[PDB]
């Protein structure tokens, strides 16, 4: 009726969306290699004839928290965590290359090296890494080199077979896709395998969700949500009062 | 007074737009760099520091801006409607228009290039410099101009604004027309 009902409704709806965005981070505190999503609000003015008094606010995801996660020491050979900044190249079920930070690796019955989510890990050849089937000792190098020991072979047979593809692009050019894999915003952009990133083998990288940061965002989203609801109530209260004009 | 490292921090938004509207500042730090637009309208600033680099637009309407030092770089436009500037220095990197309406401007540097419109409305300027090239419209309404330079390039329409033109350029490539 006054268009301030919808101006406040559109703000209250967006505050719920930001609340859900923060809720996903808290639901994913223990997730491995999880980058917390950032939430903010953007002011978009309604340009047109009349006084510039109506400005909408909509929530967006400007970026992600690319800080180093909490490293968990597991003493497992097939667990690796990226030191500092970096990524691991994996292809999902669609055969589409995407960057990940989950270094919880495993070997299937055929020998292909996958991660906890089943994404095949790429290597120097840019093809999924395949290991000889009857292994005896698998050690992951600090730079990503994979050295294996054939079954029954003596100690002095630690030959390298593959090198984990570690990619360190600009963090501002990466977006989180629909399946948690970060990809270039510009499509058809090759992932250059960096040789500077290092793996801290024997440990797993946790999530970087700042629990306090989400909680203080929640309490501010609640108060701003409630204040706009009062604006909706006072908008209809004014409308009801301004109805006796035609009540002759 | 002057602008310090922390004085400017209180007038900057998330996109580096410096707003000094009616602030009692008289000068800016030497070698000043502003990421975004700079607004110094209605300010007692008399001279811009040398080496000023603006990533946006300049607005100094109704201000005391009188002197600009050479080497200043402006990515956008320079809006000086109603300032106190008397002379325009040579070598200013300007990517927009130069609005000098209601200014005491008298002289302009030779071979000046303006990438947009040029307004010298109500200015005591006596003669446009030879080699002046304007990529937009020309406004000379209410000015003291009565003689045009021999060669000038106005990509837009020249607006006389009332003053009588006694001499026309010999080499003039005009993309528009001439209006009184």
């Amino acid at each position: 009726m006054d268009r301030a009902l919808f101006l406040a409704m559109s703000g209250a709806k967006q505050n719920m969306q930001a609340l859900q965005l923060r809720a996903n981070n808290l639901a994913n505190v223990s997730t491995t290699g999880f980058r917390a999503d950032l939430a903010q609000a953007r002011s978009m003015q309604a340009y047109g004839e009349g006084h510039p008094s109506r400005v909408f606010s909509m929530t967006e995801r400007p970026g992600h928290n690319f800080a180093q996660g909490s490293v968990i020491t597991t003493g497992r050979d097939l667990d690796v965590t990226i030191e500092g900044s970096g990524w691991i190249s994996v292809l999902d079920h669609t055969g589409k290359e995407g960057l990940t930070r989950n270094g919880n690796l495993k070997v299937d019955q055929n020998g292909m090296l996958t991660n906890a989510s089943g994404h095949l890990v790429l290597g120097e050849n840019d093809a999924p890494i395949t290991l000889p089937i009857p292994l005896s000792k698998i050690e992951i190098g600090r730079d990503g080199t994979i050295s294996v020991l054939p079954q029954g072979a003596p100690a002095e047979e630690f030959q390298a077979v593959d090198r984990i593809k570690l990619v360190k692009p600009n963090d501002q050019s990466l977006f989180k896709d629909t399946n948690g894999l970060f990809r270039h915003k510009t499509p058809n952009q090759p992932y250059e395998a960096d040789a500077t990133v290092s793996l801290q083998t024997g440990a797993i990288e946790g999530s970087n969700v700042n629990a306090v940061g989400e909680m203080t965002a929640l309490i501010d989203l609640q108060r701003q949500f409630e204040m706009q609801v009062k604006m909706m109530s006072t908008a209809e209260e004014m409308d009801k009062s301004s109805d006796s004009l035609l009540r002759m | 007074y002057e602008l310090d490292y922390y004085s400017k921090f209180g007038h900057t938004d998330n996109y580096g737009n410096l707003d000094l509207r009616n602030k009692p500042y008289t000068q800016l730090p030497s070698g000043f760099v502003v990421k975004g637009n700079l607004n110094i309208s209605q300010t007692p600033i008399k001279k811009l520091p040398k080496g000023l680099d603006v990533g946006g637009s300049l607005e100094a309407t109704n201000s005391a801006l009188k002197t600009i030092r050479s080497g200043t770089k402006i990515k956008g436009y320079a809006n000086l409607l109603g300032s106190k500037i008397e002379s325009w220095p040579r070598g200013i990197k300007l990517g927009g228009y130069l609005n000098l309406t209601d200014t005491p401007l008298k002289t302009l540097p030779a071979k000046l290039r303006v990438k947009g419109d040029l307004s010298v409305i109500r200015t005591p300027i006596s003669a446009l410099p030879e080699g002046l090239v304007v990529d937009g419209n020309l406004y000379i309404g209410g000015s003291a101009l009565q003689v045009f330079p021999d060669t000038m390039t106005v990509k837009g329409n020249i607006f006389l604004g009332g003053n009588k033109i006694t001499k026309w350029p010999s080499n003039l490539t005009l993309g528009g027309a001439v209006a009184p």
């Binding site: 340009y47 004839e49 006084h51 | 946006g56 637009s57 990515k75 956008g76 990517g95 228009y97 947009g116």
Partner: peptide, 23 residues
């Protein structure tokens, strides 16, 4: 008119020479 009053039109800006130049 009031000084410093906001305008109801997009704010002519920098990128896209189009605005930096046209008055």
């Amino acid at each position: 008119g009031i000084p410093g009053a906001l305008s109801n039109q997009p704010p002519a800006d920098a990128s896209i020479p189009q605005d930096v130049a046209q008055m």
